[PDB]
Amino acid sequence: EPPPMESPFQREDRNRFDRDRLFSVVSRGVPEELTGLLEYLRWNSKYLTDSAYTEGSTGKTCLMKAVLNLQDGVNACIMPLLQIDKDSGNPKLLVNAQCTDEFYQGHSALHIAIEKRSLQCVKLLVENGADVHLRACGRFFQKHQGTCFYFGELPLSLAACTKQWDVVTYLLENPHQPASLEATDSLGNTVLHALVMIADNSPENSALVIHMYDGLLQMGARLCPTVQLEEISNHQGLTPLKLAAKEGKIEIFRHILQREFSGPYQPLSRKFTEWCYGPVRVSLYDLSSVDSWEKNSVLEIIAFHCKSPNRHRMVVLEPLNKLLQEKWDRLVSRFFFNFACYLVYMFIFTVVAYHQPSLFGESMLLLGHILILLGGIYLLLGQLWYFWRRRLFIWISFMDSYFEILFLLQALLTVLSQVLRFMETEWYLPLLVLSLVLGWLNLLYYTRGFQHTGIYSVMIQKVILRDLLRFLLVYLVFLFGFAVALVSLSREARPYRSILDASLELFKFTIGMGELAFQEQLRFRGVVLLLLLAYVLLTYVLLLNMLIALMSETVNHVADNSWSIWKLQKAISVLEMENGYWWCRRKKHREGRLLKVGTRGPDERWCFRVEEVNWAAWEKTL
Amino acid sequence: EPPPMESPFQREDRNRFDRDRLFSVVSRGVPEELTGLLEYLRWNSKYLTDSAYTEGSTGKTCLMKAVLNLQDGVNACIMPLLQIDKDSGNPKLLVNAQCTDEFYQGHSALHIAIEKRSLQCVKLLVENGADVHLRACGRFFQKHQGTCFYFGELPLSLAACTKQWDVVTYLLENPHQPASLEATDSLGNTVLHALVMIADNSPENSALVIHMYDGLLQMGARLCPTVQLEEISNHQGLTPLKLAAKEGKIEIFRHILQREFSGPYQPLSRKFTEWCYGPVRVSLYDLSSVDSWEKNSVLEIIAFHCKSPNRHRMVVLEPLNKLLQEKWDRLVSRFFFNFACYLVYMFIFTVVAYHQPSLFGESMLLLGHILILLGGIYLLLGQLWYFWRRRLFIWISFMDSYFEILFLLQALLTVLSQVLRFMETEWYLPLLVLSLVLGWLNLLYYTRGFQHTGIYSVMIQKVILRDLLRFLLVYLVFLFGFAVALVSLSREARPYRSILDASLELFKFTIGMGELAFQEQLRFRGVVLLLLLAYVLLTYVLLLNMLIALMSETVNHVADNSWSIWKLQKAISVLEMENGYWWCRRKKHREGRLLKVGTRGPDERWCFRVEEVNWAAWEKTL
Ligand SMILES: CCCCCCCCCC(=O)OC[C@H](COP(=O)([O-])OCCN)OC(=O)CCCCCCCCC
Ligand SMILES: CCCCCCCCCC(=O)OC[C@H](COP(=O)([O-])OCCN)OC(=O)CCCCCCCCC
Ligand SMILES: CCCCCCCCCC(=O)OC[C@H](COP(=O)([O-])OCCN)OC(=O)CCCCCCCCC
Ligand SMILES: CCCCCCCCCC(=O)OC[C@H](COP(=O)([O-])OCCN)OC(=O)CCCCCCCCC
């Protein structure tokens, strides 16, 4: 168990001016009783950095203890404690000391000074030589489940994540050791990545992150105008725009994608108003990192690399709405050509399976078996090529990619049935029939091409599968227990001869075909009737409970988001159709126009023109 | 693709003082560097109007570029640019120049000056001879789907639609070229039509339209008192009151229909308060264009020419509520006489079809066949006369006029069955039986005569048909795929012999009569049982999804509008019953009384007296 960072009740473990007297001095704050420590350290040839004066488990020095105990942001023992350290000839420094444990690794006194919101204590460390790039890489400072606080591991990133502009302003320009806006942590995250990382979708945190993101980006142009702070990638190869898309942060992603500035800081904009006429506003949006022409775009990340529930809200944002709409209109002919190629494949599949012989017409049947075999191999190779490129997509989006599983399973059992027809066995017919079911159920993937059938295919999957799958467990307990009961009691002659037959007769009560009768060919005829009556009452109550719960969870008056999920379904279809087939790869067509927008700190960007009509917003500006 | 109207990033296409130097001068605004253009134009004998100085795709001149770039509503290059144009001897003028493309056709500099809300630039063009009746008839300025802005194509209509009273006041009375309130566009729409056309049903736009409608109507009496601005019809023959009814604009239609003024502008009122006593207010409403005595009234337009979802909210407004109520009371005897004539027609239809011979009593049967034949011809001629006069009603109101289709189809198969009885064939009996079904289902049209059965017949059609019709598509895929599966697997002897028989046995599971058993006369008996079990589970889940979605879309706590839809159902019945039959045409009875209301700018109008009791509104006035 990790020890506490600061405790006025539990003393630090150990794993004349000793440590216990020293730590009590800096806690109380009076510096006059620090006399005698400098002479004691020179006599024993010891330093304040060594393990005798720090906490054994972590390495918390006396300067960290003094900073952890501040009165109105100032502690009178902080300034003189560095004087004993400097005058003792320490090869290390107390200001650059860090904890060495697994939980608070790299925690420094500058991090605690920034967290205490004491600008005076932050300044006092820098004038005495505090490194402003010291890293807190302990498990408390990583983002995980449980008790943690991720802020970007840097003093400048900590000041930005805690909303302290005076610390940020002092750390960026100071004549002793200025902080770099280009600094990174173990994840490769800069201060712009860290502001994305701390953000949830609440309005208050979103206002905090957006205000700090814009301010840091503007001060980046004043200090280091020759460096694009937005285009720095981490160790996972993600820009802050790409990192917001992967982690599903709806507010900071929308603000960066539609960033608008005027006058000064105008090259820091991704949106450019072009002309306005009444309720019509026409804008130009930057397609850098957004267009799917290049590798690992925002579109590819949202469609296949994001786990967040609000992926359908990122896809309907601007310019992602119009960019994918024009891409859909160029591929709607290819989508329906693929739909026509699957109708012919299943028209042949249905005709051949309908004319299967017992265990010209024979030549037409042999040609049909070849087309099924070649069609199965073509579908098998395409889906295997899909999972080789989309390896992590099916493990996070089973409710969004199960047709890729079903197309794979239908293709495998199609080929396997033809193998079981070459080597003559009876089992090829159940496999060919079951592939006839799975392929016909695969036509419903193509209902997303039309908006009408597409939004209907979204409203039907309201959250019913994993209620009905732990509905199954209680059901199967009721069914199995009553089934093994009925078989044992029916053995006495003076109906139910197996577990499977009794289970089928009990399942018939939920389809409206349950036989309820007073059988006279059984000794125990009252008790069987009471067991059947008890099962019917228990099942009807339990089915009634399941409706009542499904209605409490699904009729909620929350706005119907079936339009957005349908747009996400097309965006997956477009981004896969833009890669072509496995045998033929389509070339990538870039979107937008190369336009000059000003001067870089010329400034040529690939801009997408968006025409938007909004009568509501225009009337409020009158 | 149309080029942008104004772009600081994309230069205008081309489809010494050249165009590129000239367009940069008027964009920046300094007029001192315009020197040399007048001498250059006289040397080359060129003008500013020609295509060398305008955009090739559209025809955007330099004056349009100068107006598109205004600083605080004024550009210093606008006034001197007209001096080079005037001094060069141009047969045309730069102020009356218009774009020639398909998208911005007829766009002038006066339109941009009004849209920029610069009264100084609007004035400066008129003193130099800007035509105030120039027309913007391009596709951007027509009302359609996509990016557009319809305002009435006129400078006065543009100023009225953008809420600029100072531009409207200046354009109507100016000593150079005043604007006419009687001016029209290609649709025939005046400024009063255009204010109706731009209005949606939001409260903010409705307040904007009503305020501009009343103000323009009052200034019409001051400027041109001898012209009725409200009675001008467009090329579709619609007054602004009629145009609001056809496009379903609930707010501006109610305000015009119940317009009340006092003192001055009192002849501009359609409602006149007659006497008040406590909570009782008695008013007189103008029946001009409203009463169905004349052709193409508001009642005829609302019932048969409107596509808007809120047609039932226009019919319950005043005086439309009391006018149709008194018309219903004069026709409720004719409605029930028509109901009694259809009961006798179907009492004969049921008796004759019940006594059909094999393939006095014979004379009574022959008389019954004649009455069915004559009754079928009478119903066929009436419905064919209906669709000759109501040609566009059945194509926009299928959920409101399908009984006219069903009465037509029942009459056709009635006559066709008698034809197939004259030429002796066996197929007349299925047609006569199916006409017996369709005629009995046609009695439910007459349930709207009673309020009780009428409002019930409205609550039952909550929106369930087109959910259950794209519910059908997924269903039919499940049913057909499992049906062709079961037939193929049942061919091995050691049930389901056709697609139709298997489809019927699978459909029986949704009516509670599905047979689930372990058949021992089939080789593949486990796999058939698993296929049946999979079909039952898939169908039950999918039926459960359809209930959950129907309940999420229909129990919404929105107020029940079944009373208003029932009133719209009677209004269609009254307006069709007022035309009489096809053989006999009833004369039209005018409503209201001819009363003098003042002096026209005597003033005799056909006024409808409405007595209204409202205790709630009276108590707030105390
Ligand atoms: C190898 C070079 C020759 C190629 C042969 C011609 C193939 C045409 C390409 C094609 O249209 O395939 C469409 C379809 C793929 O479905 P999907 O991957 O889009 O959907 C995936 C969803 N997860 O594939 C099918 O539906 C089955 C294709 C086999 C039958 C072809 C019949 C042709 C009729 C003209
Ligand atoms: C291993 C064998 C498994 C066989 C399972 C066969 C299931 C077929 C898939 C199916 O039911 O059709 C899905 C259809 C459209 O879904 P979608 O494209 O919107 O979605 C695609 C991306 N989400 O929408 C529906 O019809 C759903 C209504 C029925 C639900 C049945 C639940 C299936 C599990 C019991
Ligand atoms: C040609 C000159 C002689 C005319 C013959 C007498 C016809 C009376 C007119 C009449 O009442 O017709 C009522 C009904 C029409 O229904 P609908 O158009 O109102 O509803 C239309 C809704 N879409 O029509 C019927 O129900 C069927 C009429 C045929 C049987 C008449 C039986 C008479 C019993 C007294
Ligand atoms: C080509 C052959 C087609 C035969 C279709 C037969 C349908 C008969 C019409 C009917 O069902 O009765 C309608 C009844 C009253 O409707 P309405 O007068 O309020 O409305 C008149 C103006 N809206 O209200 C109801 O009873 C509705 C409840 C049943 C709905 C059945 C849906 C029919 C399609 C499957």
Curated annotation (Swiss-Prot), chains A, B:
Tissue expression per record: Ubiquitously expressed. Expressed in dorsal root ganglia, trigeminal ganglia, spinal cord (Lissauer's tract, dorsal horn and dorsal columns) (at protein level).
| Record-level GO BP terms | calcium ion import across plasma membrane; negative regulation of cell population proliferation; positive regulation of axon extension; positive regulation of calcium ion import; positive regulation of cold-induced thermogenesis; response to temperature stimulus
TM segment ranges: 335-355, 365-385, 392-412, 427-447, 469-489, 528-548
Q: Which reaction does it catalyse?
A: Ca(2+)(in) = Ca(2+)(out); Mg(2+)(in) = Mg(2+)(out); Na(+)(in) = Na(+)(out); K(+)(in) = K(+)(out)
Question: Which GO cellular component does the record give, naming just one?
Answer: cell body
Positions of disulphide bridges: none
Region ranges (Required for interaction with SLC50A1): 1-332
- Modification type Phosphoserine: residues: 24
**Which segments carry the ANK repeats?**
16-57, 58-104, 105-150, 151-186, 187-235, 236-262
| Cytoplasmic face of the membrane | 1-334, 386-391, 448-468, 549-622
Topology term for the membrane: Multi-pass membrane protein
Gene Ontology molecular function: calcium channel activity; identical protein binding; monoatomic cation channel activity
Q: Where in the cell is it found?
A: Cell membrane; Cytoplasm; Melanosome
- The answer on whether this UniProt entry bears the keyword Transmembrane reads yes
Query: How this protein is processed and modified after translation, per its record?
Result: N-glycosylated. Phosphorylated by PKA.
Keywords of this protein's UniProt record, alphabetized?
ANK repeat, Calcium, Calcium channel, Calcium transport, Cell membrane, Cytoplasm, Glycoprotein, Ion channel, Ion transport, Membrane, Phosphoprotein, Repeat, Transmembrane, Transmembrane helix, Transport
Q: Entry's Pfam families?
A: Ank_2 (PF12796), Ion_trans (PF00520)
Give residue spans on the Extracellular membrane side: 413-426
- Name the job this protein performs: Calcium-permeable, non-selective cation channel with an outward rectification. Seems to be regulated, at least in part, by growth factors, like IGF1, PDGF and morphogenetic neuropeptide/head activator. May transduce physical stimuli in mast cells. Activated by temperatures higher than 52 degrees Celsius; is not activated by vanilloids and acidic pH.
Q: Which family does it belong to?
A: Belongs to the transient receptor (TC 1.A.4) family. TrpV subfamily. TRPV2 sub-subfamily.
Q: How does it assemble?
A: Homotetramer. Interacts with a cAMP-dependent protein kinase type II regulatory subunit (PRKAR2A or PRKAR2B) and ACBD3. Interacts with SLC50A1; the interaction probably occurs intracellularly and depends on TRPV2 N-glycosylation.
Q: This protein is called what?
A: Transient receptor potential cation channel subfamily V member 2
Organism expressing this protein natively: Rattus norvegicus (Rat)
The uppermost taxa in this organism's lineage are: Eukaryota, Metazoa, Chordata, Craniata, Vertebrata
